[PDB]
Amino acid sequence: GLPVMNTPGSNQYLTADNFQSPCALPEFDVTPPIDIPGEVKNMMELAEIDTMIPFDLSATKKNTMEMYRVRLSDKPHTDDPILCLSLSPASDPRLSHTMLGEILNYYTHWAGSLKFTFLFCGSMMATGKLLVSYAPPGADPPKKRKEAMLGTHVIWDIGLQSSCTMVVPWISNTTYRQTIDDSFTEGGYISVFYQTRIVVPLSTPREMDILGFVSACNDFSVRLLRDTTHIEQKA
């Protein structure tokens, strides 16, 4: 026969391999495809869809509908945060379960720009200006508008365009970040503040909710496929 010499790797089974193998049902008449709507070609397409953030994971609000609602009110102006969030899209508990967070938990590395969009759900009569902030890592995380203003931000004026978007631009030392909590590849701080205050007339609710959404920009990518911690099978 043709002289051959068996090399290392011979007879192993690598679950990531890509070889040919014999067909157990030869000449099978395959059913043709039909043009079903909603075909997906790449998981990042799903990461670019806005999904809603469970911002308020307090002991009584978590795992209920309330976790998605961020309560605002018409109280006097303060420089104190409405919310504070770490830019760790796969590991921060508020981001890890969003569709983006979920897909990122099947990969080791992520890179690219993200965007946060907030929806005001108070009455038409309610007005207000808010400041949405992104502080790249390395300094004290912002707890006052004074610090948050110095970073990347959008001052949102509430009105007919119900929603506002802040883009978190890819600003990183490394070319990809890890999808776990890691200081070396930390992403920084997302926060929201009152710029002026929510103002309402009489006969109007004085408290209301905003909802927030996160999605990936067209420059966003992931790599090194891995199993997720978000599902298990005990026994």
Partner 1 sequence: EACGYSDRVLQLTLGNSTITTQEAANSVVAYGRWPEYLRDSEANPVDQPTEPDVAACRFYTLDTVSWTKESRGWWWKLPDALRDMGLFGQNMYYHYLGRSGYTVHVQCNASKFHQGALGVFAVPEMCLAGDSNTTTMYTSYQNANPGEKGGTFTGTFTPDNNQTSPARRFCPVDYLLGNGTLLGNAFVFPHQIINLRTNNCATLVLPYVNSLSIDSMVKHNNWGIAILPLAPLNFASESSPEIPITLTIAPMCCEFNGLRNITLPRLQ
Partner 2 sequence: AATSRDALPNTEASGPTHSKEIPALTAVETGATNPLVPSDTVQTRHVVQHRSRSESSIESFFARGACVTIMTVDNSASTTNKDKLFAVWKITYKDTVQLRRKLEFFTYSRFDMELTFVVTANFTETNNGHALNQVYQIMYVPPGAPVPEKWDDYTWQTSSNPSIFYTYGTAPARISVPYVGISNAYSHFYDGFSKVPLKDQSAALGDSLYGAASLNDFGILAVRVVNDHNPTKVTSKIRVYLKPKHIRVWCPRPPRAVAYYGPGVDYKDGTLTPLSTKDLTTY
Partner 3 sequence: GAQVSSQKVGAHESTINYTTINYYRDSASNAASKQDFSQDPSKFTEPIKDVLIKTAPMLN
Name the site residues for a copy of itself (rule: CB under 8 A): 1-11, 13-14, 16-19, 21-26, 28-29, 31, 175-176, 221, 223-225
Least CB distance to a copy of itself at residue 119 (A): 21
Cβ within 8 Å of residue 109, ≥6 positions away: 176, 177, 178, 179, 222, 223, 224
Distance CA 159, CA 126 (A): 9
Tell me: does residue 234 bind partner 3 (CB under 8 A): no
Sign of CA dihedral 176, 154, 81, 146: positive
Which long-range CB contacts under 8 A does 138-142 form with residues at least 24 apart? 138/188, 141/84, 141/189, 142/81, 142/84, 142/189, 142/191
**Burial class of residue 98 (count of CB atoms within 10 Å of its CB; 0-12, 13-18, 19+):** buried
Residues 145-184 that bind partner 3 (CB under 8 A): 160-163
Question: Which residue, 170 or 176, has its beta carbon nearer to a copy of itself?
Answer: 176
Question: Which residue, 6 or 161, has its beta carbon nearer to partner 1?
Answer: 161
Instruction: Report DSSP state, residue 54.
Output: -
Three-state secondary-structure class, residue 110 = strand
Of 233, 229, 235, nearest in space to 106 by CA? 229
Least CB distance to a copy of itself at residue 20 (A): 8
Q: Which does 193 bind (CB under 5 to 8 A by kind): partner 1, partner 3, partner 2, none?
A: none
Least CB distance to partner 1 at residue 65 (A): 5
Least CB distance to partner 1 at residue 108 (A): 18
Question: Which residue, 13 or 28, has its beta carbon nearer to partner 3?
Answer: 28
Largest CA distance in the chain: 95
Residues 9-48 that bind partner 3 (CB under 8 A): 18-23, 25-28, 30, 33, 37-42, 44-46, 48
Question: Which residue, 2 or 59, has its beta carbon nearer to a copy of itself?
Answer: 2
Tokens found for residue 172: 């990183």
Question: Which residue, 48 or 66, has its beta carbon nearer to partner 3?
Answer: 48
The contact mask relative to partner 3 for 192-221 (x = CB under 8 A, - = no) is -----------------------x------
Least CB distance to partner 3 at residue 84 (A): 28
Three-state secondary-structure class, residue 220 = coil
Least CB distance to partner 1 at residue 137 (A): 6
